[PDB]
RNA sequence: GGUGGCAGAGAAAGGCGAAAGCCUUGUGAGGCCAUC
């Protein structure tokens, strides 16, 4: 149900970009409250696990992130970008709210992310 | 308890059970507010 295809590098380092941002900025875990900041223009970049189900949980999320300027790209399972942002290890969605020291890898993730 | 609104937790919570253990929880546990 994707929008588009994220080649398997881009994911590994989308996933390493979470793993250090969770310990200098600030990330949120779940669709809700991911989206509640993407739609208060907090979210820097969004992520979308691809084995969602039922897959109504993030297909708002692409749209929203659109029109709101935000870069999302997706991801394999909701198990890795859980594991990956820390705590319960399990994440339909997540956002990076605070960039932390990580400010020049996401911006070279999402001009890649734009690439696509 | 119903409805509406917050917030965000797994070395974690609440539910059921004599017990074994099972159920539910970032697909939102406990909690808080308003309202019926
Ligand atoms: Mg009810
Ligand atoms: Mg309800
Ligand atoms: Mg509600």
Same mark, same amino acid.
């Given at each position: 149900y994707v929008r588009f295809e994220v080649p398997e590098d881009m994911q590994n380092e989308a996933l390493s970009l979470l793993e250090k941002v969770r310990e200098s900025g600030k990330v949120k875990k779940g669709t809700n409250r991911t989206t509640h900041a993407v739609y208060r223009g907090l979210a820097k970049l969004v992520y979308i696990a691809e084995?969602?189900?039922?897959?109504?949980?993030?297909?708002?999320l692409p749209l929203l992130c659109e029109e709101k300027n935000v870069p999302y790209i997706y991801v394999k399972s909701k198990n890795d970008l859980g594991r990956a942002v /820390? /705590?319960?290890?399990? /994440?339909?969605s997540a956002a990076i709210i605070n960039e932390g020291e990580l400010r020049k890898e996401l911006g070279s993730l999402v001009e890649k992310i734009k690439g696509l």
């Amino acid at each position: 149900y994707v929008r588009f295809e994220v080649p398997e590098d881009m994911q590994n380092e989308a996933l390493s970009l979470l793993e250090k941002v969770r310990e200098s900025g600030k990330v949120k875990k779940g669709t809700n409250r991911t989206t509640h900041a993407v739609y208060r223009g907090l979210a820097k970049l969004v992520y979308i696990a691809e084995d969602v189900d039922p897959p109504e949980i993030v297909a708002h999320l692409p749209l929203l992130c659109e029109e709101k300027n935000v870069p999302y790209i997706y991801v394999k399972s909701k198990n890795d970008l859980g594991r990956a942002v /820390g /705590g319960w290890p399990i /994440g339909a969605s997540a956002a990076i709210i605070n960039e932390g020291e990580l400010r020049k890898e996401l911006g070279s993730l999402v001009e890649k992310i734009k690439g696509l």
